[PDB]
């Protein structure tokens, strides 16, 4: 899993405005500390800081995952419509999201499992359309050995053809014109290994 976070950290660049989705993507913040980066919170903040000190907590200040946070110098607050104007308006450089499934067409399913987990999409559907670049990071297979990189999603979609890049513990994939392409192997992973654990059809570029 560290291979996922670290590899995703390399996608951040100086001067970017970035939204990290809940789950794995929040860990990416820790790998980037030496960079000039502004993190956006869809609940109405630009400039998320570190988690506070015990006793320095403030209930009016939290991230989209409902965690107590702090702000950086030059942060700003705004309302939810302002917030999704920023996102939908294409102002966010990068959105990193988790997923239950990704297909070869760049489709992401991350909000529900029918008659199992219904929780909701939150702002994920806005983010997948608005962000200049959308990155999904995710474990290649689940608990039971099932591939989460698929020919087509079996779960309800968060978006169709919205994923630019996918990073798993096995490989790195990129998406162009309905085609999936393997661009990198994670350290200690073999092409054969990936071809085996991936249902999705993809062209190999290494």
């Amino acid at each position: 899993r560290e291979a996922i976070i670290k590899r995703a950290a390399k996608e951040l660049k100086e001067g970017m405005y970035v939204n990290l989705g809940i789950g794995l993507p929040t860990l990416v913040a820790n790998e980037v500390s030496g960079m000039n980066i502004v993190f956006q919170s869809e609940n109405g903040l630009l400039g998320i800081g570190a988690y506070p000190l015990e006793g320095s907590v403030d209930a009016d200040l939290i991230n989209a995952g409902k965690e107590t946070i702090t702000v950086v110098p030059g942060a700003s607050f705004f309302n939810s419509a302002d917030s999704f104007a920023m996102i939908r308006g294409g102002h966010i450089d990068l959105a990193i999201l988790g997923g239950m499934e990704v297909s070869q067409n760049g489709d992401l399913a991350n909000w529900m499992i029918p008659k199992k987990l219904i929780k909701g999409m939150g702002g994920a559907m806005d983010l997948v359309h608005g962000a200049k670049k959308v990155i999904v990071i995710m474990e290649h297979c689940n608990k039971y050995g099932e591939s989460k990189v698929k020919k087509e999603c079996s779960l309800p979609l968060t978006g169709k053809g919205v994923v630019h890049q996918l990073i798993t513990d096995l490989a790195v994939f990129e998406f162009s014109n309905n085609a999936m392409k393997l661009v990198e192997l994670q350290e200690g992973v073999s092409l054969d290994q990936v071809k085996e654990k991936t249902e999705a059809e993809f062209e190999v570029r290494l």
Partner: protein
Amino acid sequence: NKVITDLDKALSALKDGDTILVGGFGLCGIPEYAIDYIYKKGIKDLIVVSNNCGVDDFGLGILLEKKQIKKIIASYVGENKIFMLNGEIEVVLTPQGTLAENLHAGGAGIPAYYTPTGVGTLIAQGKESREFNGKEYILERAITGDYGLIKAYKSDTLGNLVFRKTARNFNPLCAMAAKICVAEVEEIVPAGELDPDEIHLPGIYVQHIYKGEKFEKRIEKITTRS
């Protein structure tokens, strides 16, 4: 002077079937006293528009106990367990950005607008779709309500509000899109003490102002460093 000392002054006429717009994100920026007045009085069959349902024992989750909510329009229930499969409550899941913009449109006199969000998902079902510049967008309808119930930090006597940090969220949107807006605040100051350029919500959107003695301001997940 819109200041009231009794919530019933603002809420007396709220009845069963009414549509209420409730501010807050998770437990952050929630109208605790308003939600409380409704739990006590037992208003039923409410249509609720709120980003979340709160949590099992707090926020909007409160009203679920006696099943006062027939229908809720929200983007996320994720923090809540008890929260449907029964069918006793209809849940219209809306993308958060759409929810926010629907409310904004409602307050701004805009009936409908297009958004790329939700295209090619269950969200697009039963909605008009259209193309603009090679991209597909779906048509979303404004939301309005009978009562806005919002939380803010500070108000003047004219109902000018300022919010605090991420507590703002949906709050101003619920005020603007609601026929009758009541705001509960931690501080009230005389008109003129709030700078004109510091005001978040102009008082024209606020019908009533209520100072709560104490807000619980519960935190769902407390995360600290080193």
